[PDB]
């Protein structure tokens, strides 16, 4: 009985493969060949942030594009005034094993998580003056790889139990758990319209969810190893992943397949962080060989390199206004590039 | 010229001072990654040592020991084992009453790229009742290729040698020890290994070693 429908499942997989093959009448490489190259982009470290003491693992920008978030092994979640290199807050963590952080789009709340299996949400704009913890979201059975705010009252967390979930911060319950990943989810990014998101697990597959229906809409499986980072294209109709095989791949939602692969023969180290630019022409990827690369997302050429970190870069993200990109590394240093 | 909001800079400097004080306070603590098989005596060894992820902390001879039982994560080890880099030692413990799962885990954690230069404190826990097992079920049952005397001492030595044979880097040490669940001495062994590691790190920082 199991094989009777396993054959049907294999037939369905072959059918979707044939459909995607038929839909690929061309490729991005031979369509964007007439576009002039973006050239060589040289970025200089405008500001460096030297507050942390051990292994910054995560980072998130504010919506105002001036305030950062920084989560390190030191057990501190210090948010920076990036313009003046000031520390406007210093949140001590209950557990120093932090793997992710997020800044709410309104700027009121900052989240955190890690090996403690709990997404603890910290209220910044408190009447008491200090930064208390508002809610401790529990229910996951794996390390929290990533977490992002839909708004002040909804957060979606990607955990290490091969599931992602959508939480109600006011009540603290799992409003809608997402399942379908065979391996543990390691990354997560939300669409600009916020109606849907994607997640990349260690099964070398990135799936398209939707926060309202709760089902899985499409699956992209072009990689070969564990996926460590995902980011949408700015228009929300494509996204770029990053895995341990040192290749970043750009999948497009409409054609449901893979458009381009950003791989070079001189790099054999996996990507830890990926983010686009404001226009979407660039593609900033943070590699394990201590340095970041910027990729011409429409031509796959290495536009430039962002070196200056003495250890593996673990986080990377451009601001909403696209003015600068921040890279955090295991050297406990943050740098702002322009 | 800063405005009257240079109090923001003052607050930033106060935050930096608090961060530096907290960092120098935390550096004085010793971090141990406790590791092993399921029901291998980790709970027993922590309970005898005076007290998701669970951290056990105790003080012995003016050292603050922090033991992290990372056995509570039933996920892919490689995706979070890089968190426990830069620990002083790995207090790996096995159950002699068992086994090849322990050998596989030891091989995985001894040659890991992050833990190449990290010392391992190996505990052959529960060696009091291993005599009962070896008196009725010889080590040939657990190790088919083992040939030789079936005495308690020789069997324990063979198991210890098998565990130490999974070590390849000559720059790391494996302080093997036997617990027999009586304990009251594992703290001393961990303290001596941590003292060796601390002295080696101090020599490394000064360029001597």
């Amino acid at each position: 009985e199991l094989d009777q429908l396993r054959q049907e499942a294999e037939q369905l997989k072959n059918q979707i493969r044939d459909a995607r093959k038929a839909c690929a009448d061309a490729t991005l490489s031979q369509i964007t060949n007439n576009i002039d190259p973006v050239g060589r982009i040289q970025m200089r470290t405008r500001r460096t942030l030297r507050g942390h003491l051990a292994k910054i693992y995560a980072m998130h920008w504010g919506t105002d594009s001036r305030l950062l978030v920084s989560a390190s092994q030191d057990g501190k979640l210090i948010i920076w005034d990036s313009y003046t290199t000031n520390k406007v807050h210093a949140i001590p963590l209950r557990s120093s094993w932090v793997m992710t952080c997020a800044y709410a789009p309104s700027g009121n709340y900052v989240a955190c998580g890690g090996l403690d299996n709990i997404c603890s949400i910290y209220n910044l704009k408190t009447r008491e003056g200090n930064v208390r913890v508002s809610r401790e979201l529990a229910g996951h059975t794996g390390y929290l790889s990533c977490c992002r705010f839909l708004d002040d009252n909804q957060i979606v967390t990607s955990s290490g139990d091969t599931t992602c979930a959508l939480w109600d911060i006011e009540t603290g319950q799992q409003t809608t758990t997402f399942t379908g990943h065979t391996g543990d989810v390691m990354s997560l990014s939300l669409a600009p319209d916020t109606r849907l998101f994607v997640s990349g697990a260690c099964d070398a597959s990135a799936k398209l969810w939707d926060v309202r229906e709760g089902m899985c809409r499409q699956t992209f499986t072009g990689h070969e190893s564990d996926i460590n980072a995902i980011c949408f294209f700015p228009n929300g109709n494509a996204f770029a992943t990053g895995s341990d095989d040192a290749t970043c791949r750009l999948f497009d939602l409409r054609a449901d397949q893979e458009l381009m692969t950003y791989s070079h023969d001189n790099i054999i180290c996996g990507i830890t962080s990926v983010s686009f630019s404001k226009s979407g022409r660039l593609l900033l990827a943070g590699y394990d060989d201590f340095n970041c690369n910027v990729w011409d997302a429409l031509k796959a050429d290495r536009a430039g390199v962002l070196a200056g970190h003495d250890n593996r870069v673990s986080c990377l993200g451009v601001t909403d206004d696209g003015m600068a990109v921040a890279t955090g590394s295991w050297d406990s240093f943050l740098k702002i590039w322009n | 010229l800063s405005a009257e909001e240079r109090a923001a800079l003052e607050r930033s400097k106060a935050i930096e001072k608090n961060l530096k004080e907290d960092g120098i306070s935390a550096a004085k603590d010793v971090k141990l990654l406790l590791l092993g098989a399921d029901n291998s005596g980790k709970s027993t060894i922590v309970k005898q040592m005076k007290i998701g992820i669970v951290e056990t902390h105790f003080t012995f001879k003016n050292l603050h020991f922090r033991l992290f039982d990372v056995g509570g994560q039933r996920s892919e080890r490689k995706k979070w084992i890089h968190c426990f880099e830069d620990v002083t030692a790995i207090i790996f413990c096995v159950d002699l009453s068992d086994m090849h799962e322990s050998l596989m885990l030891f091989d995985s954690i001894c040659n890991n790229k992050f833990f190449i230069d990290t010392s391992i404190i190996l505990f052959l826990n529960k060696k009091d009742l291993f005599g009962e097992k070896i008196k009725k079920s010889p080590l040939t049952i657990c190790f088919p290729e083992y040939t030789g005397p079936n005495t308690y001492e020789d069997a324990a030595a063979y198991i210890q040698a098998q565990f130490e044979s999974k070590n390849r880097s000559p720059n790391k040490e494996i302080y093997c020890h036997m617990t027999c669940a009586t304990d009251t001495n594992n703290a001393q062994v961990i303290f001596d290994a941590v003292t060796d590691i601390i002295i080696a790190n101090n020599l490394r920082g000064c360029g001597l070693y």
């Epitope: 001036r66 406007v88 008491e128 003056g129 | 405005a3 607050r11």
Partner: single-chain antibody
């Protein structure tokens, strides 16, 4: 909740000395930089002293420098203003005013109840209208100018609007000329350009009756105040 209570008021012969205590409870008193302002029985607010978080920086007004001193005890959560050589110009009510300074913060958010202490190159701001009659349901505008432009080089203009209802402590309404204080109704709105500033209230309510004070925070001053009468 947040609550600052002051003690130390009373009758003093001129030239003596007295200390005013500000017992603060309900908030992280250590990280806040508490101020101290005073208001004469028939006049407006007048800043007196200021001690930061950790007592690392302290400032005084010209008319009070030397005679007074400000001290904070974080473990006991009290603020002290030791006053020496009191004169008849110090007859006022002293308010213990909260303030926390960081990017996006709202200084002067909370104000103490006050203690009536009675005894037997500076930016000056002017509010032209001493008092303007108003009616409920209408829209009224209150404007004050400054001698020196309050717009710093970082794009922030440092103007704070305070409202003092009859017999009540002043409340922060607008900080930095455009940002509403937490809890203030959205009726109030701020505007201005460098030197000339204006505050507009849409659909005035009967509870908004009071004197409005605008203060500059560019450097180490209030205005006369425009009393609104229904």
């Amino acid at each position: 909740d947040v609550q600052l209570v002051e003690s130390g008021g009373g009758l003093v012969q001129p030239g003596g000395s007295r200390k005013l205590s500000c017992s603060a409870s309900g908030f992280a008193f250590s990280s806040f930089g508490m101020h101290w302002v005073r208001q004469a029985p028939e006049k407006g607010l007048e800043w007196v002293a200021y001690i930061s978080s950790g007592s690392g920086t302290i400032y005084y007004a010209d008319t009070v420098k030397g005679r007074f001193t400000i001290s904070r005890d974080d473990p006991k959560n009290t603020l002290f203003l030791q006053m020496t050589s009191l004169r008849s110009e110090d007859t006022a009510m002293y308010y213990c005013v909260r303030s926390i300074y960081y990017y996006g913060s709202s200084p002067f958010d909370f104000w103490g109840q006050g203690t009536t202490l009675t005894v037997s190159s500076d930016i000056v701001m002017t509010q032209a209208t001493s008092s303007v009659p108003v009616t409920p349901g209408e829209s009224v505008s209150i404007s004050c100018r400054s001698s020196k432009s309050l717009l710093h080089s970082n794009g922030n203009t440092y103007l704070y609007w305070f409202l003092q209802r009859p017999g009540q402590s002043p409340q922060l309404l607008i900080y930095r000329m455009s940002n509403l204080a937490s809890g203030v109704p959205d009726r109030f709105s701020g505007s201005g350009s460098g030197t000339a500033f204006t505050l507009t209230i849409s659909r005035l309510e009967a509870e908004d009756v009071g004197v409005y004070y605008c203060m500059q925070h560019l450097e180490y001053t209030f205005g006369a105040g425009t009393k609104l009468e229904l």
